Amino acid sequence: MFSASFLPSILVPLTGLVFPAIAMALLLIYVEREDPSGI
Amino acid sequence: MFSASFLPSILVPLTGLVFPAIAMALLLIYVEREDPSGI
Amino acid sequence: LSGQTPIFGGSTGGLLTKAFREEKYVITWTSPKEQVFEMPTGGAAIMRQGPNKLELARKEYCIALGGQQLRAKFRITDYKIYRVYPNGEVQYLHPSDGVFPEKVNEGRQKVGYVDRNIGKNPDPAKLKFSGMTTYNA
Amino acid sequence: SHSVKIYDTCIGCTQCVRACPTDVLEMVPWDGCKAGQIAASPRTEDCVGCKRCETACPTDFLSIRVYLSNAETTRSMGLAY
Amino acid sequence: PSRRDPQIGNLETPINNSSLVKWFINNLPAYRPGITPLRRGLEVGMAHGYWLLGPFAKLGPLRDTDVANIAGLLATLGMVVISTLAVSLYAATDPPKPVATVTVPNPPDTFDTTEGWNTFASGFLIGGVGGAVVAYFILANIELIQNIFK
Amino acid sequence: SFEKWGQPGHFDRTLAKGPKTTTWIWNLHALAHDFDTHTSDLEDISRKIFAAHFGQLAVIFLWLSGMEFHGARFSNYEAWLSDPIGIKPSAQVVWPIVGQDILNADVGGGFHGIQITSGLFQVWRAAGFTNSFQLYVTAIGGLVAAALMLFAGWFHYHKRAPKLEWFQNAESMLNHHLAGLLGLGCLSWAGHQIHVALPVNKLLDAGVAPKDIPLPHEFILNNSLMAELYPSFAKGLTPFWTLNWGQYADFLTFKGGLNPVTGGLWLTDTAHHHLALAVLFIVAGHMYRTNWGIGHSIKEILENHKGPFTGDGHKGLYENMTTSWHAQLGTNLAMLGSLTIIVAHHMYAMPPYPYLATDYATALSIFTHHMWIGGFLIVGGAAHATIFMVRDYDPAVNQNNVLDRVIRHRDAIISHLNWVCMFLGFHSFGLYIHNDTMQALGRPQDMFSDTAIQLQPVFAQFVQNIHTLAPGSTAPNALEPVSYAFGGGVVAVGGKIAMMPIALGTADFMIHHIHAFQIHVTVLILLKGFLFARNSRLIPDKANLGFRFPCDGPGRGGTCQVSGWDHVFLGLFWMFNTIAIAVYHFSWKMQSDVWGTIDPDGTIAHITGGNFAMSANTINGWLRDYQWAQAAQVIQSYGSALSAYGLLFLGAHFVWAFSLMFLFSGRGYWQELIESIVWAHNKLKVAPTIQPRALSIIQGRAVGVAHYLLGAIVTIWAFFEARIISVG
Amino acid sequence: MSISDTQVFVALVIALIPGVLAFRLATELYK
Ligand SMILES: CC1=C(/C=C/C(C)=C/C=C/C(C)=C/C=C/C=C(C)/C=C/C=C(C)/C=C/C2=C(C)CCCC2(C)C)C(C)(C)CCC1
Ligand SMILES: CC1=C(C/C=C(\C)CCC[C@H](C)CCC[C@H](C)CCCC(C)C)C(=O)c2ccccc2C1=O
Numbered sequence A, B: 001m002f003s004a005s006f007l008p009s010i011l012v013p014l015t016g017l018v019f020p021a022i023a024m025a026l027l028l029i030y031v032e033r034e035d036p037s038g039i
Numbered sequence C: 001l002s003g004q005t006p007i008f009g010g011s012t013g014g015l016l017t018k019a020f021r022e023e024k025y026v027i028t029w030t031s032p033k034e035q036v037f038e039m040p041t042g043g044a045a046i047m048r049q050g051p052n053k054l055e056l057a058r059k060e061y062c063i064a065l066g067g068q069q070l071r072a073k074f075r076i077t078d079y080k081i082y083r084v085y086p087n088g089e090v091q092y093l094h095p096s097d098g099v100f101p102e103k104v105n106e107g108r109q110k111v112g113y114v115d116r117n118i119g120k121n122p123d124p125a126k127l128k129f130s131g132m133t134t135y136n137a
Numbered sequence D: 001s002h003s004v005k006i007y008d009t010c011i012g013c014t015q016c017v018r019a020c021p022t023d024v025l026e027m028v029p030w031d032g033c034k035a036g037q038i039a040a041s042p043r044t045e046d047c048v049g050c051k052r053c054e055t056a057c058p059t060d061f062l063s064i065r066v067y068l069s070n071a072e073t074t075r076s077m078g079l080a081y
Numbered sequence E: 001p002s003r004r005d006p007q008i009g010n011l012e013t014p015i016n017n018s019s020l021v022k023w024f025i026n027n028l029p030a031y032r033p034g035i036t037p038l039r040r041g042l043e044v045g046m047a048h049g050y051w052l053l054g055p056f057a058k059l060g061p062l063r064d065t066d067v068a069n070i071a072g073l074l075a076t077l078g079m080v081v082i083s084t085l086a087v088s089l090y091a092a093t094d095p096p097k098p099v100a101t102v103t104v105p106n107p108p109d110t111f112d113t114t115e116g117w118n119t120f121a122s123g124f125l126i127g128g129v130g131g132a133v134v135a136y137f138i139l140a141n142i143e144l145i146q147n148i149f150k
Numbered sequence F: 001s002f003e004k005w006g007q008p009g010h011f012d013r014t015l016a017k018g019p020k021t022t023t024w025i026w027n028l029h030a031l032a033h034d035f036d037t038h039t040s041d042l043e044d045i046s047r048k049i050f051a052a053h054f055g056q057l058a059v060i061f062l063w064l065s066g067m068e069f070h071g072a073r074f075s076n077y078e079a080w081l082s083d084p085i086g087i088k089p090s091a092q093v094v095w096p097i098v099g100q101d102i103l104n105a106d107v108g109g110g111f112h113g114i115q116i117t118s119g120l121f122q123v124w125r126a127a128g129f130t131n132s133f134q135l136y137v138t139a140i141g142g143l144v145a146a147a148l149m150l151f152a153g154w155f156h157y158h159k160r161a162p163k164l165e166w167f168q169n170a171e172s173m174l175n176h177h178l179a180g181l182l183g184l185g186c187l188s189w190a191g192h193q194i195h196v197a198l199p200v201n202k203l204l205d206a207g208v209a210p211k212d213i214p215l216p217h218e219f220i221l222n223n224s225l226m227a228e229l230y231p232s233f234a235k236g237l238t239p240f241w242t243l244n245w246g247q248y249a250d251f252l253t254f255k256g257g258l259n260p261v262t263g264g265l266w267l268t269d270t271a272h273h274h275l276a277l278a279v280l281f282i283v284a285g286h287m288y289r290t291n292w293g294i295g296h297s298i299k300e301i302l303e304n305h306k307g308p309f310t311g312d313g314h315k316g317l318y319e320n321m322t323t324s325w326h327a328q329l330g331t332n333l334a335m336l337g338s339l340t341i342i343v344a345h346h347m348y349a350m351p352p353y354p355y356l357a358t359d360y361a362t363a364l365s366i367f368t369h370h371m372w373i374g375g376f377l378i379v380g381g382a383a384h385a386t387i388f389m390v391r392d393y394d395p396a397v398n399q400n401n402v403l404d405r406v407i408r409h410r411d412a413i414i415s416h417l418n419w420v421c422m423f424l425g426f427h428s429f430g431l432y433i434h435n436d437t438m439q440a441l442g443r444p445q446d447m448f449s450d451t452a453i454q455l456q457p458v459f460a461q462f463v464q465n466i467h468t469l470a471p472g473s474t475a476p477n478a479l480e481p482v483s484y485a486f487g488g489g490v491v492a493v494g495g496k497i498a499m500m501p502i503a504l505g506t507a508d509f510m511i512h513h514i515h516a517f518q519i520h521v522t523v524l525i526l527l528k529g530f531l532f533a534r535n536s537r538l539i540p541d542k543a544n545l546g547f548r549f550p551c552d553g554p555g556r557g558g559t560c561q562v563s564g565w566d567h568v569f570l571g572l573f574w575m576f577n578t579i580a581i582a583v584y585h586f587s588w589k590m591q592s593d594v595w596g597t598i599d600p601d602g603t604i605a606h607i608t609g610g611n612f613a614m615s616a617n618t619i620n621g622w623l624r625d626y627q628w629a630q631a632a633q634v635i636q637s638y639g640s641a642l643s644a645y646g647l648l649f650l651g652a653h654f655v656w657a658f659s660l661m662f663l664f665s666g667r668g669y670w671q672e673l674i675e676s677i678v679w680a681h682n683k684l685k686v687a688p689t690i691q692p693r694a695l696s697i698i699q700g701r702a703v704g705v706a707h708y709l710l711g712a713i714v715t716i717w718a719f720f721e722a723r724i725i726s727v728g
Numbered sequence G: 001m002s003i004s005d006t007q008v009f010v011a012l013v014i015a016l017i018p019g020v021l022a023f024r025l026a027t028e029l030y031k
């Protein structure tokens, strides 16, 4: 490769998969919140 | 070694560790006892 | 007990869990003037008008303020102190003499005494296998 | 808490009652000397052990003493916590 | 603007009353409602036994020997055992002032009771063992990524 | 007019009556200067301070002129002139009687005496001093100026004393001092330098007949020899009239490094340095507002800087800085202390005098002296800060200010502080003793140096690196790096090192970290006394009662040592530890891998042999590999002509133990023993009328700590003095 | 030529200044 380290090998999956996962999970539980508070 | 058996191999840990353990546990529960009985 | 407290932002020398579950002390007095002053838990504040509720965890701070601060500087001599139980019971611990005189009354509390010279004093040399001390005559 | 001890040498200047910050003294009526009111300890339970009082007693062999006991508590130990 | 009185020994600094932090702290298994003390113990054991084996796995005196994996496993096993012992005896002597100091706006839960503590310790034991074995499995095949070689 | 001295207690009304007991003596030496404890007036105070300052300056002039005079009539300077290498300077010739006759410090040329180490001749190798008669005149001038300004103090106190508004013009104060004092003195000294210093320095390259070299009068109006060198220095060509300065590239240059023909740096850089500083802080010191209706209203600047976290900013701070004095005292003391220790930490990499790195005796003496003074007085700065807190404050002018905002949340600060101290403390020392055990346990692979478990301070290495290649780009008009410990070539002269790059491996880590550790705990103690000065969580009468008092009775258990200066007691113990191990570290490294001898290949054969990479990792090694070398001669370093000075290191231990005696013991015991001796004396009719009374516990604590410090510092200076004599 | 750990550096300059600055500029408008 080049003078950088492994990083481009494994830093895509978490951004590709797990961060979307928590994003949509938090989002869904957000769109059902009680009243009148919400985070 | 000598004419004795394994004993000096493993008889220190229980005296070293577990007997102090029960000692201090029993002691602590003793120093909090109710009234007027205590063992 | 008045719904008012001197002007004071805040600090970290406040109360603990021992305070609102074992005891609180209370002190009140009459300050028709509002003057900046100090407090024993660190920091300064400025008093309020008329009734002035200062609630605290110990006793000696109220005594120090009443003696060294209030009447020694600002001449206010009608502060009352109380001891608040964990449930709400209050004890008029002081003034046990009303006017804070510390020496005047027509009759006072009379129980016990010792008016005895010390050269002649009971000793463990004599008092043996008892539970008392030199407080005999 | 601790124990307090009174004697006869109280001249009655009453510098101790103005020194103790713990409200454990009062001048009860006496007759013997010109004092007519001798100091005593009605409220021992708030004793602190500072014994600033006898340092304020001017009498030769200062008239008050404090026998420093052993039955201490949160009050006698004086903790804000 | 203190919690209830500006003269109390507490401050409204934007680190102990920030909305982000309060949401992040409330939903932790120590406080998030709608669960049993059992699950609390299970999850805490899972987490801790899942991370508390590396700190001596390749760090122990057997660091570079060809066995140290199961060595660290046994070590953390004994560790979680004695931790459960400690918390259990604490429960055994627990009930002076049977409370916990409350600063979260609400009380945490009815988790504050002796037998509750005992059940919590049991679940802790189970989850800790579980986290231990699962971490040992993740770490077992050194080639876990070499087969992927990504 | 002499009817007035022998009336003691003239300043106090209480102790003026009579000496009842011995106590009356003690306080006599205790309240002779705090005249803030005499009245409420201030003009008198200020006048006293002025006169005292004048007296201190007078003794300054006296001692410096006398030291000169000794340097003129009893010092082998003018013989050491022609050779500063093969001769070791000396002074204070020994008086030939019984006891001091073998102590003739003969330093070649038959000159006996005492081989001194203070490097004044080094100044006298830069000032270009030929004959001792001019020096005689110099001492005469110093002493007459001393007497002159002393007379001036007498006059300005007894005849014409200044008024009160004369105090608080800090604006004109800063302007006058900053500009006139510093800039004019510095530029005058630079003018002296260029006219005389570098000329004779030139003339000290090859034996150019020093006394035969002309005198300054031969250069005041004689520009011919001044036109020999520096063609632009004909007169000056005076191109400053033409704004052109390119001609002056002769003397006013920028080299920045070691000059291997002087034992120090290139003096031209120092001259241009002084010029630049002079004009720079001249135009600086021209800042503040004064009598021409132009300038900063400085009491409004601090009003402006406030904000959300600030509260109300720096409002209301000048009443503190002018109405009270102890404040100024404390802050200036702290700043001076810090400045002094950086000076110490500074002048062993950039020697600013001739023959400094080549002279391996004066260096660490100067270093350690200044370093000790630094701490020894910054603690006093903190003490005066505390005394301000107890003496001067205000509940009114201190509402919510950046000052008050900490005294309200002190507990969090100090708790987190304690946290940090504990962390660093064992994180360092327990790690150390862990490695100790491992080495003693046949487990050497568990050590922590390069040959074992790793840790490397990359930050220092990278900063030193980015310092190495500085010139050219960051410093285009610059020739060599600023020093040679960061990077460059190993600069030297003879078989004797001047400066080589210093290596930071593994052992640096824990050393610097325990430095930080002790500094943290020191701050902890001092700041703790600072905040908890007026009111504690148990004692709400501290400021209501004082700051110098022993205790408050056996209430709450014990309460002894609850004042503040006992806090500074503990603090001074700790700073003793700090500076002691600091000087240990410095001396050992700069004798282990910086200093030694040299071969024709530049081969630096250091004194010890790089012992840190070998033993400065375990405790038992630290005693072995340091004090074995630091004493193995002092045992036998006596017993001949230039050895007879049996040093009082053998003697200091006694004062140390006698010290610790005072600490551990109460006083009532001594009082009763005193009463028994009094009984006996009274039986034999010799009872002293003035009834002796034992020391007060604070007095005893003070004398104990004093003797402790004295013994320790005497011991250590004896140590490394003899150690350098074994190599210098 | 090309670069080194200095790229971990330029990564480090992010996630404090731009990261939480943008975080605040987002959460200002009351989700
Ligand atoms: C550190 C130290 C030291 C030292 C010190 C010093 C070194 C100082 C310096 C000082 C200086 C160095 C000073 C100087 C000064 C100067 C000045 C200040 C000047 C001024 C000037 C002027 C003022 C001018 C005038 C004029 C003239 C002359 C002519 C005409 C014009 C006119 C008028 C302008 C000692 C050892 C002691 C001690 C220890 C420490
Ligand atoms: C010894 C001692 C005394 C006794 C010391 C007293 C009573 C001082 C008496 C005055 C001294 C003895 C005069 C000093 C005499 C000169 C020092 C001259 C003698 C020569 C010597 C230098 C050899 C105390 O009173 C005391 C109090 C509190 C804590 C510790 C101690 C303590 O350690």
Ligand code: SF4
Pocket (backbone or CB within 6 Å): D009, D010, D011, D012, D013, D014, D015, D016, D017, D038, D039, D056, D057, D058, D059, D062, D063, D064
């Ligand atoms: S004990 Fe002292 S203060 Fe109290 S009445 Fe007697 S003399 Fe007065």
Ligand code: SF4
Pocket (backbone or CB within 6 Å): D004, D019, D020, D021, D022, D023, D024, D046, D047, D048, D049, D050, D051, D052, D053, D054, D066
């Ligand atoms: S210590 Fe002395 S002053 Fe304090 S309460 Fe007891 S008797 Fe009174």
